[PDB]
Amino acid sequence: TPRHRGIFPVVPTTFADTGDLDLASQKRAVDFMIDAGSDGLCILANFSEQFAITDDERDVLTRTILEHVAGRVPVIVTTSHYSTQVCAARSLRAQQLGAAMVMAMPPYHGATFRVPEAQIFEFYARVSDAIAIPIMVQDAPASGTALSAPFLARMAREIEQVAYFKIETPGAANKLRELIRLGGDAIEGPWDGEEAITLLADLHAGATGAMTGGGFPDGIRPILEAWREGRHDDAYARYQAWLPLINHENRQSGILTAKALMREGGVIASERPRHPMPELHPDTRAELLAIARRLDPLVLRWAH
Amino acid sequence: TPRHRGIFPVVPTTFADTGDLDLASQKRAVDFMIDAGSDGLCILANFSEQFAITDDERDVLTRTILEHVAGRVPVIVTTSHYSTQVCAARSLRAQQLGAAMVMAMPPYHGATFRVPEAQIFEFYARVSDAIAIPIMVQDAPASGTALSAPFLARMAREIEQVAYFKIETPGAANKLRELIRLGGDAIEGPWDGEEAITLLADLHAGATGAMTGGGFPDGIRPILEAWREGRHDDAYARYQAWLPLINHENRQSGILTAKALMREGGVIASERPRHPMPELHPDTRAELLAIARRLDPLVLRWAH
Ligand code: NA
Ligand code: NA
Secondary structure (H helix, E strand, C coil), X not given: CCCXXXXXXXXXXXXXXXXXXXHXXXXXXHHHHHHCCCCCEEECCHHHCHHHCCHXXXXXXXXXXXXXXXXXXXXXXXXXXXXXXXXXXXXXXXXXXXXXXXXXXXXXXXXXXXXXXXXXXXXXXXXXXXXXXXXXXXXXXHXXXXXXXXXXXXXXXXXXXXXXXXXXXXXXXXXXXXXXXXXXXXXXXXXXXXXXXXXXXXXXXXXXXXXXXXXXXXXXXXXXXXXXXXXXXXXXXXHHHHHHHHHHHHHHHHHHHHHHHHHHCCCCCCCCCCCCCCCCCHHHHHHHHHHHHCCCCHHHCCCC | CCCCCEECCECCCCECCCCCECHHHHHHHHHHHHHCCCCCEEECCHHHCHHHXXXXXXXXXXXXXXXXHCCCCCEEEECCCCCHHHHHHHHHHHHHCCCCEEEECCCCECCCECCCHHHHHHHHHHHHXXXXXXXXXXXXXXXXXXXXXXXXXXXHHHCCCEEEEEECCCCHHHHHHHHHHHHHXXXXXXXXXXXXXXXHHHHHCCCXXXXXXXXXXXXXXXXHHHHHCCCHHHHHHHHHHHHHHHHHHHHHHHHHHHHHHHHHCCCCCCCCCCCCCCCCCHHXXXXXXXXXXXXXXXXXXXXX
């Protein structure tokens, strides 16, 4: 019954080699990910290097990418901010610009500044009140913020637009199972993240969507489709084939993985981060390409 | 002889009751802090609630405050951003508008995104390359980033504008002593923070400046003056008197401490944070004002 399910990869932010936004490459990345079979796209998330860009740049990218997707697949726009009012305003604008959904971390800042549960609940209520499209709660280590399954489920039951979840804290499968149990019908989207590293456990737990890196959603989507067709052994085989690539993303090359692949495939002009994020080490990048070449992903043969 | 020394309190950000910037109260807060005898002022720092505002608000406050200060005391503008190029651009703009100094945390994001030391060194080197005013490195728990005393001293010696330090990690006094021993003449400003909680110990370690809360710099500055005069017993007596207030700010009322006291004193219109930062609990605020009234600080008798 959910409005959304399947694979929702994170669109990377493309820069020129000198760090300015490279919107021409940005559009190509988007077109490639659509062609790779993505069910939807998530933009301006932490895999998109959003911590490295300014508010003005976020807005340029949100308009640029939504216009370019052109209604082809639903887009989740990341709108996280400590201020409830700022987040609410970003989420309304994203809606007005054509987002299907927004995603927000709970409000926090840095390693030190956190917000009591009661006020986190208010933050999401007020953002929900401002908008008419669903909210995805991002449950990730970078917030340093504990969001228990009961609390998450209580938000989904009591707050109209809270309906989707990116569960990326350790033991996601266990937590997904509990969220689903406690939240019932209100949990529209029990999804995972972490570049699909725990995808097969999370599907057994009831995950119905996955937010992966943007480099090879074509390789991962069939795992979700096999699971959806009731073919758990076939899902195992597909996961086994691609797991070394998912694992190298998750443990070695990280955020830049999708960009190294796209730059190798000629999809984007530069795979660099903005300074000071470090470049991929040479052996790490060489290893990454070597693994990808064993798997023949679309990004290395995208004839556009 | 350092270019700057003494008390450099953090200016709070003043909002209207409904969360909008209240620039009229902002200017009054600034004037009160100057009348309290501040040697300089630090703006848009984490005690200024900088995480709850937008980039556009940051620029507005930077312009407005520098203009209102009118060259009367030096201003340190906080320019922290994960992006080097972004921090550089903020820092250059601050210099254009009359800032005496910028302060930046090392690049990081949230609880999880850090940058290796070599990249941090490059981050500060390129910011220094951009500007002609000094940089203060902010060494605080919120970045979750370790900056060793040897590493700080090496930036000080090797990077032209790196010359000041706000040392607010645990054991500040020991770390200051080592910073000064290693960095020699390049350490222009070995300063502390944490609302002056460890001020007397940090003075013994050789601190020459203190970045405090903005509510009662008139109470704390004479501690540094007594210390400069060589009257360590008189410093102790002054520290003892004001310590419960400094302790309640540090442990109980936190960021909002300066705003509660200014609102009580009719300096600003509203002491509220932006949601979802929680309001002071009532016994916490009542206790704060009770301690403050035992000490007759200027903020409660500022007839303007
Ligand atoms: Na993620
Ligand atoms: Na501080």
